[PDB]
Design a binder for this molecule. Structure first.
Ligand SMILES: Nc1ccccc1Nc1nc2ccccc2[nH]1
Ligand SMILES: Nc1ccccc1Nc1nc2ccccc2[nH]1
Ligand SMILES: [Zn+2]
Ligand SMILES: [Zn+2]
Lengths: 360, 360
């Protein structure tokens, strides 16, 4: 059975389990069970399942080189699928809440969940909470007697927290650190002094790389009982690297991918986000180019957004992006080679992850 | 050392631990560490610590009758305090998010966290997320080698989920179940057919009783390694009972306690909440009284709110409340007596819980 089919079948399984448990133990009625079923489908399905499928792909790699009974192989695959869905649901939580936080309009070519007529923000904040609770309900149900449950929960926990810290880094990224104060309304930075590579790196590392790369990779290792096939420091480094590159890609696409292929009208410029484009532009701009960026960035006026987009195109950031990508390729290949010392199999799963990231 | 002092000292300890860990492992800067420190203080401190202190009180009861080394007594108390704070932080999460969900204005005589000038909803949704993540960071750090950690996490998890299900029961309580649909904007009920005791009971049981009574009681038992001193079905029943009574009390206070003692201007009438007042009024009203309730409930117009408050006073709900309270006293005393069979000590902790609830 192909990996995708198996992963989707487990969705249906987990969904049925969660809805049936709500009826048998949480006194739910059928209409609310329905609403929740539709919330789950709308918020968790539709993407490429890159995260959840990474878990499955890492486990498939170990299965190919490890002696197991058939029933054991099926168990391990089922665990990987469940683990995968945990990470997908974790994502779904973050996306629902982030869309609300940011007043976003669309996500994947459909309206953000909170904008559905019969949802609203008052329900959507809670639906997002439920999404994350379901990760834990799944884990405790499917993984209760598993040797890895402790390590899996502890890692999951740390990643979730990292992700929320990262969200804070991100939503504050256009404030001046020295002025942050719950008592005082926050002005946008005027100097852009904190739009640096180190700062940008910190935002992306927490907000995306831990849940998008490190969690799927390590979860594949845990459900495989293979975390001692690998050097964990290397897993982190490669995760953080490919993860930053995934986010530079999304930053570039926010600005330049037309909205039909992006699945939304990007608003990083209007929102004054600390993007790779902005940091890189500021790292090469002359005094006049800086001054004009400052007059136009972080304002809703489309004329001003167009001045920023012009500045970017004429600063030839395409070239900086090629250089960035070349350096990431060097470093990723290097880390893969290092991974081969203790696990050729895991190194190859990491190669596959890199390839899928490179080609999206 | 008195229980309150010990509980507050552990706050400072846990806070220092969380902030120091953010700096050493999450690359935080001092200004964000500050912001988070102030968020934690503002959202977690200021109440009566009823929940967290219940954990401590249950553990103190077992300490008085169980032979332990001094260092073991101190460990158990420290665990209870940490466990207590978990539940307080869980509360703080729910309060931040609920205030946002509901567009609430005040909480405990201060502005809701999201309304602080330098917070805003975009940050506050995430700060609430962080609040809940901290419960898990505390547990894993202080409880990593404890025999009860598995049971404690699993219970915590189930209670959190119950609480989020309850929130959904509550925010939907003025819709007609048969019309819930994410695709269709939700009309307020016109018949009030779902304003019944059973339905009301379901809302309160999930939204409040699990995190306010069941969690503190059971967590005291777990950090005491005493869950086999008790009949768990009885703990649940007593929790659900005293818990419903706590919420009837809050419902009555929403309507009739003046805003300076309540700490906010209650808006259950404007919000069309399924309150004990509304259910009870509907259970005794004549046709004309029902018709007038329906013309006035769930509307912001203060004239209309005043008609609802008049209907309530003139329906002499004071008497229904006395009867309700008398029946809860019968049932609570009964369950305490049953609890005495296996644990006189735990029965007494439950007696103390009841007394504090009765007198607030
Ligand atoms: N990572 C990052 C993110 C945002 C802005 C700057 C950087 N740092 C960086 N170092 C490089 C070394 C060679 C090529 C490109 C490079 N980019
Ligand atoms: N619990 C509840 C909540 C909201 C509305 C009704 C009720 N049920 C009920 N049964 C009683 C038996 C004697 C006295 C009062 C009573 N209330
Ligand atoms: Zn965002
Ligand atoms: Zn509420």
């Amino acid at each position: 059975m192909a990996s995708m089919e198996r992963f989707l079948s487990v969705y249906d399984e987990v969904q049925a389990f969660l809805l049936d448990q709500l009826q048998s133990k949480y006194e739910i009625d059928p209409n609310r069970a329905r609403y929740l079923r539709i919330m789950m489908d709308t918020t968790c399905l539709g993407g490429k399942y890159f995260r959840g499928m990474t878990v499955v792909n890492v486990a498939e790699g170990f299965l190919a080189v490890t002696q197991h009974d058939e029933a054991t192989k099926e168990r391990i695959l089922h665990d990987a699928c469940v683990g995968g869905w945990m990470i997908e649901f974790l994502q779904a939580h973050y996306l629902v809440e982030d869309d609300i936080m940011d007043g976003s309009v669309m996500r994947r070519g459909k309206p953000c969940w909170y904008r559905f007529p019969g949802v609203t923000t008052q329900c959507a904040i809670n639906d997002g909470i439920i999404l994350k609770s379901w990760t834990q309900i799944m884990a405790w149900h499917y993984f209760a007697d598993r040797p890895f449950l402790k390590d899996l929960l502890c890692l999951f926990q740390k990643v979730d927290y990292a992700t929320a810290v990262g969200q804070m880094y991100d939503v504050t990224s256009m404030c001046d650190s020295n002025k942050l104060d719950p008592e005082v309304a926050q002005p946008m930075t005027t100097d852009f002094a904190e739009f640096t590579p180190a700062i940008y790196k910190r935002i992306v590392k927490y907000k995306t790389t831990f849940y998008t790369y490190l969690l799927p990779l390590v979860m594949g290792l845990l459900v495989s009982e293979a975390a001692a096939s690998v050097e964990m420091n290397l897993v982190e480094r490669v995760a953080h690297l490919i993860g930053e590159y995934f986010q530079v890609q999304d930053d570039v696409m926010d600005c330049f991918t037309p909205p039909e292929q992006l699945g939304k009208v990007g608003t990083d410029i209007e929102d004054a986000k600390c993007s790779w484009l902005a940091v890189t532009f500021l790292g090469k701009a002359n005094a006049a180019q800086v001054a004009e960026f400052k007059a136009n960035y972080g304002e809703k006026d489309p004329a001003k957004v167009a001045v920023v987009k012009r500045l970017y195109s004429k600063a030839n950031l395409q070239a900086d992006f090629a250089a960035y990508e070349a350096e990431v390729v060097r470093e990723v290949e290097s880390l893969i080679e290092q991974l081969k010392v203790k696990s050729p199999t895991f190194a190859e799963s990491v190669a596959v992850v890199w390839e899928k990231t490179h080609k999206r």
